[PDB]
Structure 1
């Protein structure tokens, strides 16, 4: 048998679901058909309404304590929770219900991990990350907006092979993917080290791939696999394509000033 995954969606943009299906190794097709049993997921599931909701009770009973809850997005606490409604009820009620009997909880992306864009000031819905609502269950955070596809499927692959959550850092992120800052192995680092910087878009320095620090790159303070694993089967990453890192895997990155203001010190 394949481990059931119940994939819930709160307030989100669905980028994490989209990133997941970009995975080349393993293919999302192979994950769905051969690795997990993806039993509930709003994006892809055949059943709707009453038939969809009926799946949750069935899996939770049959696989009690032996399914994975994956959460994309987050619950809002304002508007009596009804700024995110599922089955006529607040999302937070669904989240708490499904979480109770999960063997592990994955917080996909910056939304579920920390709050992401809807939690940026002044956070009109009081969007709240999963670990602040679910406080009695093991939660692995997989932050990024979205996370890299192979990071997402890498987490799943580890969990299914070993029936364990991988080693986490103090912020709950898997060390196997989030141990390095972008700036550690960024290919533009030799330019940084020599004080060779882009100062205006499309200047001579930009055309030579000089460091993007002075254009606001937040690589020096951001932990992710982007510089090495890179994006979309290692095709590029933000810096390689010419834009500084905006810090998208870090808690509260929307409220750390303009993306184009350089780090100080």
Structure 2
């Protein structure tokens, strides 16, 4: 299975995260799983005209392209020319057009590629967009009706960056005959990773249940949930970040950092407008503006009051102790 991994408006974080892959690690994925990595800007040996030969052979159908991985945004500025992202003699968006049209499967890795991500933040100088989404709005660069040659839409492996497993396990599934096991949600994300929430497996959910808030960073995060004071988007964000830990160690929320909802197409949420960074926007100083997914402010708040009154003592003390 040939893989061509291109980077548009990328920071290469998805590649670096991918390189952190374990079980399989990246080398075993590239070699031992029958995935022929044709080229990758961070890893491909070919430069210049040899690399362009590889790209053109993929684009024109001279050689098969099974998986086109795209990382980074599709940069369309200036004026829709895409010349703020010139790659191998073309605007990167033209490469995207050709290769997405050539690939059996197109995988957008990372929010930039999936939805536009950080570069698509206003004022979006690069005219960045995702492959098939611009933020939540379906269509992105390739249009809502784009399908790869295997009939799939762009497989969106979101995250900023995506966790290595979010792509590697998909690649293994494709390589092991389990492509049919891959189900995609409405954002084209693999449901095997994105039916759960970041909160799922969060070490602070018991504090969340009892509405015990982390009050401060550092040692303050030895207790409490980050939802109330730090804008944790865990309960509104689909991800397996607390199921499949980052770097096989931790997750933002475990570590005391609020989930920024990076697997969600709106990321960065509120465009990091003043007062929204590591803060919970609240109505009347008590009611979070955004409640967990599938809840309503009145039942949430009622249950929150009930949970506060019935809170056990341990939920009000440090638990992640030295």
Report the TM-score when normalising by structure 1: 0.92
Contact 1:120 1:255 in 2 (8 A): no
Mark the runs of 5 or more structure 2 residues left unpaired by the alignment: 133-139, 148-152, 281-287, 290-296, 298-322
Residue in structure 2 matched with residue 238 of structure 1 by the alignment? 252
SS at the partner of 1:130? Answer: coil
Contact 2:207 2:225 in 1 (8 A): yes
1:58 maps to 2:71: no
Contact 1:120 1:252 in 2 (8 A): no
Deviations 1:216-251 (A, max 9, x none): 111011110111111112x11101111111111111
Cα distance in 1, alignment partners of residues 267 and 72 from structure 2: 16
Cα distance in 2, alignment partners of residues 19 and 197 from structure 1: 30
Q: Which has the higher contact order (CA 8 A, sep 6+)?
A: 1
Contact 2:261 2:269 in 1 (8 A): no
SS at the partner of 2:122? Answer: coil
* Deviation at residue 63 of structure 1 after TM alignment: 4.1
TM-aligned CA distance change 1:146 to 1:254, over 3 Å: same
1:46 maps to 2:45: yes
1:200 maps to 2:216: yes
Residue in structure 2 matched with residue 140 of structure 1 by the alignment? 155
Deviations 1:93-131 (A, max 9, x none): 111111222111000011100111110111111101011
Cα distance in 2, alignment partners of residues 236 and 26 from structure 1: 19
Contact 2:58 2:102 in 1 (8 A): no
Runs of 4+ more than 6 Å apart: none
Q: CA RMSD in A?
A: 1.7
Contact 1:21 1:149 in 2 (8 A): yes
Residue in structure 2 matched with residue 69 of structure 1 by the alignment? 68
Match of 1:7 among 5, 8, 21: 5
Cα distance in 1, alignment partners of residues 163 and 262 from structure 2: 11
Mark the runs of 5 or more structure 1 residues left unpaired by the alignment: none
Deviating more after overlay: 103-112 vs 127-136: 127-136
Report the TM-score when normalising by structure 2: 0.76
| Residues matched between the structures, number | 259
Residue in structure 1 matched with residue 170 of structure 2 by the alignment? 155
TM-aligned CA distance change 1:121 to 1:183, over 3 Å: same
